Amino acid sequence: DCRTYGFNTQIVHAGQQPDPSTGALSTPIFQTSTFVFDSAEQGAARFALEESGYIYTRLGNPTTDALEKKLAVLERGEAGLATASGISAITTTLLTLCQQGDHIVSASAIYGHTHAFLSHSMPKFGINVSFVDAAKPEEIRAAMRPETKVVYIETPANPTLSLVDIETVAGIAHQQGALLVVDNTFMSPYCQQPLQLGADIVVHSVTKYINGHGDVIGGIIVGKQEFIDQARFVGLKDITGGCMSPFNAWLTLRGVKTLGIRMERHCENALKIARFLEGHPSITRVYYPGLSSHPQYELGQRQMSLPGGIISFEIAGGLEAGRRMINSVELCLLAVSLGDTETLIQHPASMTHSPVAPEERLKAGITDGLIRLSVGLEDPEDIINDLEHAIRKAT
Amino acid sequence: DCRTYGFNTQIVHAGQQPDPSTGALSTPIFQTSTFVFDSAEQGAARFALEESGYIYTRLGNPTTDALEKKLAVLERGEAGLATASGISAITTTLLTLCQQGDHIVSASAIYGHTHAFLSHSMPKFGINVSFVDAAKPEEIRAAMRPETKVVYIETPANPTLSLVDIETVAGIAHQQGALLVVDNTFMSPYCQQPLQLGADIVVHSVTKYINGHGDVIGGIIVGKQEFIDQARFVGLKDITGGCMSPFNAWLTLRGVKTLGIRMERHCENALKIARFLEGHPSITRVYYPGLSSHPQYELGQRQMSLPGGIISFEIAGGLEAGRRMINSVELCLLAVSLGDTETLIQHPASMTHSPVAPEERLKAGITDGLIRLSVGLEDPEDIINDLEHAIRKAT
Amino acid sequence: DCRTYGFNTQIVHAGQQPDPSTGALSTPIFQTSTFVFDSAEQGAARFALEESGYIYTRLGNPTTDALEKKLAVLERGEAGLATASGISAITTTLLTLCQQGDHIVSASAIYGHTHAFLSHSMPKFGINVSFVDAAKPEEIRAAMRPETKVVYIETPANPTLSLVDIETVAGIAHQQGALLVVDNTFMSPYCQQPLQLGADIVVHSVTKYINGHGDVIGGIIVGKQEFIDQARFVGLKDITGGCMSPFNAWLTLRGVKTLGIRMERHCENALKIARFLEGHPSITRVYYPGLSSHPQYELGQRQMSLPGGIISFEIAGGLEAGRRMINSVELCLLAVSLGDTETLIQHPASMTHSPVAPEERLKAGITDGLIRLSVGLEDPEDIINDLEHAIRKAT
Amino acid sequence: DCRTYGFNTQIVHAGQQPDPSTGALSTPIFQTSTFVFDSAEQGAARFALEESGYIYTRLGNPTTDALEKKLAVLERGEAGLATASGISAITTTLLTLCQQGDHIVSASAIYGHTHAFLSHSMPKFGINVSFVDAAKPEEIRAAMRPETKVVYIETPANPTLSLVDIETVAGIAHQQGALLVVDNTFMSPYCQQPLQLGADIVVHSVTKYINGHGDVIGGIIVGKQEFIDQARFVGLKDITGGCMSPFNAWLTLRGVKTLGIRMERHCENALKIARFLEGHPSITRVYYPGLSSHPQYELGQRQMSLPGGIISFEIAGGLEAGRRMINSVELCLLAVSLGDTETLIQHPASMTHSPVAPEERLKAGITDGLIRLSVGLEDPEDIINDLEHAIRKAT
Numbered sequence A, B, C, D: 001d002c003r004t005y006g007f008n009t010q011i012v013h014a015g016q017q018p019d020p021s022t023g024a025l026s027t028p029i030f031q032t033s034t035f036v037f038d039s040a041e042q043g044a045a046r047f048a049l050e051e052s053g054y055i056y057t058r059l060g061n062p063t064t065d066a067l068e069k070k071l072a073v074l075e076r077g078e079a080g081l082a083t084a085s086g087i088s089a090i091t092t093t094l095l096t097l098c099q100q101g102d103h104i105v106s107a108s109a110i111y112g113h114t115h116a117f118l119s120h121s122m123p124k125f126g127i128n129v130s131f132v133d134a135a136k137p138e139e140i141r142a143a144m145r146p147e148t149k150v151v152y153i154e155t156p157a158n159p160t161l162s163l164v165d166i167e168t169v170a171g172i173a174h175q176q177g178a179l180l181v182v183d184n185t186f187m188s189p190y191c192q193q194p195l196q197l198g199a200d201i202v203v204h205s206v207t208k209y210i211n212g213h214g215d216v217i218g219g220i221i222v223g224k225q226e227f228i229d230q231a232r233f234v235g236l237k238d239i240t241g242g243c244m245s246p247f248n249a250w251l252t253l254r255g256v257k258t259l260g261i262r263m264e265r266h267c268e269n270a271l272k273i274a275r276f277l278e279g280h281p282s283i284t285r286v287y288y289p290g291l292s293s294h295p296q297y298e299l300g301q302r303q304m305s306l307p308g309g310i311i312s313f314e315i316a317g318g319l320e321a322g323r324r325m326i327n328s329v330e331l332c333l334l335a336v337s338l339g340d341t342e343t344l345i346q347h348p349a350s351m352t353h354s355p356v357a358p359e360e361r362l363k364a365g366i367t368d369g370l371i372r373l374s375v376g377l378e379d380p381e382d383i384i385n386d387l388e389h390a391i392r393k394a395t
């Protein structure tokens, strides 16, 4: 039983075994749309969910099934469901759970396209959402209504890597009859296990650390079998249609083999870079859970096995400085994703949020000098030199 | 301009050209999650939709863009949007268009998972749906309400390959202020062009004939640029997350190269097989638009350039006969998809709809002896011999 | 037994079946390097070739095995062996068969890199080669020696699509104790079957028509089991190492599904274009086996079921005209391969053979005005218009 | 310049950059056979090697070029050449260098299929080979002849992980006018750099650690540009045809991103497991360069940055014990490859070499109790427990 081995052993083996018919060690790429039955009877036995086996890849596929099983084991969940994207993991989940008249309490400090879905799309389906500062569990409690079905959080959260106390929030949600859904993208199961802290459902964008190689868009949902069966057979099948391609599942299986050693190196690197930035007189602030001045440092130590691979920081001199800095890096690459093997950097005030009113960005935690860094697998000395050179230039 | 060449030339070339940097003839597989910017300024220029280029594959990708452009040309539409599945093409479309309080008029004779989405999921978002017999355009008119945003049809329709008069229905929908959405999966653009008949939006499951090779789940939406931009930047980005993987897009580009020659052969084969079945004294009925006894035969001749690759038929002796028949084929393969290079066969009363009450199936057009056949690229004589042998055995 | 069905049925089905463990219809992509054994005993049973099954993909793989079996059926050969390239199919074959002191009789009119291998590499291994005009079977006989192990031919042959009488040459080779190896790349098994005419071994570059989609480099060898086992376990395993990747095998399996309908359309198109060129007063010569003035026309009719998709022709005005013409096409693409879905064109005197002495090219059949055309799946009217426009411009 | 960064930075970045036309961060998969030219002139400019760019994937491809460049940087070589297999890397190399009448001095302790090529195939091309114990550099010197073109070694070598002193052997080979070719498969460039020690040419099977994921068969050659150009344009193009598919190159690029962190973990694990085995009273011998009793331990410390991921050991009780042991593991997988993320185990006397005469195996270093272990990325405690359990059972 794969649930019995060590976590690195599970990373490598859980959900997978040699192909029964051939012995192939790699999980085969079942790049098929349909599946053949031996008889009328076998076709019937599968459709009524009266007998196990495959029918059609939108419903289930052996390659994707391996990925779902592996991630269920890694998050200590019953079952997994792969999706087309991180967005689809979130929306499949919430659209399965909620209907007209229901309510959601959401953290404000969440991924931007998640916020758009919650702010604009949900209310158009009759589903109301209240946003709160989830670093303050009391605001979550105060926002709960009789109609609240879900509490939704991300931790750590952009853009300043603030935290949410999963265990505390889970207790509050459950006392009030709601489910807790946690987006665990930033951490991966190697660094944080929300189900073990009382969350009901975990979602990821596997696009970030789980795949890790910057070449797959995808999501995963993990939770109880009863829920996952609804997310599969109603949410995905009927509502979003957000299935993962078998090739993408295979790539993610391949990427996740190195999850443990990648996370160790990302976090070792990031701690070094965060300490460098904290010592730098041109840098006003450094946001990183591994720094002891982080305002929720102790919580982070309890909840996270490592402080993560992402750092935010503020450069002296505001917008122009941030722009000059990101324009002066030679090694770090300018891009908006994270969790890849390459170090990526972005300056949201000049890049993504450049048309947004400067005062709105500030309300949103986005100061003019804020830079976000996804630390890769390069030598940290080279990343530090590159940052040092660019900071010197920018200031 | 690719919109100027013949249709076979467009099938091969539209949306594609040699790679500019290398000359590679095959469209490269851009199996990437993110895209790098040259500067802060270039990153900003893309996000505000102020300058063209790529950002992130959930938003857009060069491989997928080629597929979208090709299918837009083939359907004579402005723009295309690829999706994770045929379901996602439909739901992305309808969830973009509709909100709480809106209404849809839908054909009853539609794909089963579409019917589930319309029957069960839409009403839970406050979106009501009226089902009608779309072979009777008057029932569509009578079901229209002030709140009706969309009329939704499939033609030909399962299970008896009845038709819908696209042009007539489009006129009725537009007079009453609604959009017409047509699922053109069964035909492909090679055989039917709903936009040219007044439809506003076409959707496909590319899983069937467009890909054609039984190895891709995917969808596509084609329509006006203004609509497609909303389906991309709200529907997909925010709501369903149903993006297509670049690999799947490349496979579908590859599959669609042979669309014209495949459709010609599927339809040539199917006409021969349909005539054989019509002459067979053990077969009570044959449903095929190429047979002159089809009740909408003339409409079909006007609307469709070929009668298609799908045949339904009823075998003497009801359920037991249908089961014995599908259990007695040696060449045809028992499976529930269609539009693959292999001939596929299914007996819905014993396979898919075996737990459904026999009288409900009958209301739904599914008689106990009904067999559905997706005609492949084999020698038709071999398919005929296989059917002949199995029919003889079954009766 | 797949060897019993019609040829189109075999194209679709031979060598393939639904996956036994899952029912997946598409052959799974077994993208693996190794294979696991259940026990020491099972590992031993495979290595001594004492029991069937897989060990390691360089030796054999289930995806590649399907391709090998399919092509063996299509060529009416016992066994198949896939390779990294068409070159590797040829060299694996000849390096398996021949050793220091042996001799080969080869056609002169062969693929250029084949000629280089025969002219320069073989003699450096002590293997001598005599080149002859294989359109004259007597020259083959006259060149035979006691040490001659192989007679090697291509038909049709570049650059003027001359033919070789397979049956006649086979008889001559066998009387003198030699094997006949035929490169059947230009025809595919759909159009010519050298084994049925007495050849011992057929090779292809699957890069051309068998794959057909311009996205795979690969080869195949077909022949008797005893030979193929030597080509696999010595030639490939030890000598060239030229194994095919499972992904490439899967792509070629996918491409070959449409071989019959592609060849029909390539040849229908090519006959139309060849007739157009023959009627054009700016074109001095047209080389195409489907034209009745071809000097071996009747032989072609006996030996080939279709005249093929390749045309060569000579434009009035020599080198400058040929260059102006290829520079003036808008639809045809300038490239050196053939057998793709797109129409490709090349002018060897200005492109490939531009540094070669003009008189050497002439000895080699390459006149200054010679253009080679690989006819694709576009509308022939569009290809004709494009050629017409470019010829008018060039002259 | 990528040759200036740290080695981990080079692992991630060398040979790669964002796509120029699109910014895609992942190297695109250029899964193409041919490449289009803009004009006759551009086609000519490429063929004569008079201008840079692509022509045809057997000759060169942008995806494969990235892999070749990366591995050249990592081995501190001028140029790289990817191949279909490790075998093809070796044979392409040696068949390029050598012709009838030439001689090779080879280590005896080399990969088995290499030994077959050298023992049986080379002499049939007039190329003689002398095998020597390359742990004794004097035997290499004594075997040199006026005709010796190459000295060929592997280090560490199977089956007992003996070493060869690269620097010493290079000096001996060069004094006598020969090239030194080193198979660096077992180490990877992360652990050993033969070019930096005076080797002329390095080869790998990328099937093992460079790819690392058990899903690619492939090779690479690294050396001087003048040599590599001959290996490409004669060896590969003409002789072996052993090109690598672009997909396989992309997979290997992806796999090699984690080379540094994988090697660190493989070797950390292997040292722990080797120490465990050395302390075990049922284990008579343990072969591992990281153990101080290894007979060439100091050499290993100078030549290798880590002691590697492979261990051989001898179990008490000979053949029956070895068989019982490999039949009793539950976590380790029975297979013949190495360098994958999963721990693999084999007992050559019962598996591979079971039909070989027991006394021949002994001459070859293969004792009846010898087990070979490729240590994966699992928790070492789990691998140790699995070995402990199986050893206890076997004895």
Ligand SMILES: CCCC[C@H](NCc1c(COP(=O)(O)O)cnc(C)c1O)C(=O)O
Residues within 6 Å of the ligand: A085, A086, A087, A088, A111, A154, A183, A185, A186, A204, A205, A206, A207, A217, A218, A219, A336, A337, A338, B056, B058, B241
């Ligand atoms: C387009 C902006 C880049 C996206 C990226 N975050 C994406 C992201 C998602 C959405 O996942 P998908 O992209 O697979 O749908 C979900 N959850 C988190 C925490 C995310 O960071 C970022 O850089 O924040």
Ligand SMILES: CCCC[C@H](NCc1c(COP(=O)(O)O)cnc(C)c1O)C(=O)O
Residues within 6 Å of the ligand: A056, A058, A241, B085, B086, B087, B088, B111, B154, B183, B185, B186, B204, B205, B206, B207, B217, B218, B219, B336, B337, B338
């Ligand atoms: C699972 C049942 C097989 C599905 C198949 N019809 C699927 C299908 C879809 C849905 O497309 P996707 O599967 O890509 O989401 C949409 N539209 C039509 C007309 C369809 O036939 C059939 O055999 O009818």
Ligand SMILES: CCCC[C@H](NCc1c(COP(=O)(O)O)cnc(C)c1O)C(=O)O
Residues within 6 Å of the ligand: C085, C086, C087, C088, C111, C154, C183, C185, C186, C204, C205, C206, C207, C217, C218, C219, C336, C337, C338, D056, D058, D241
């Ligand atoms: C590089 C020149 C293009 C090659 C192409 N002929 C390639 C080719 C080969 C070699 O096959 P591979 O390329 O798979 O090794 C073998 N046999 C024939 C008849 C060929 O035409 C041509 O256009 O003639």
Ligand SMILES: CCCC[C@H](NCc1c(COP(=O)(O)O)cnc(C)c1O)C(=O)O
Residues within 6 Å of the ligand: C056, C058, C241, D085, D086, D087, D088, D111, D154, D183, D185, D186, D204, D205, D206, D207, D217, D218, D219, D336, D337, D338
């Ligand atoms: C089939 C036996 C398994 C092969 C494996 N060694 C394969 C191998 C090769 C050959 O490489 P390819 O397989 O990519 O052609 C070259 N060099 C070394 C050192 C090898 O170990 C082993 O387990 O030793």
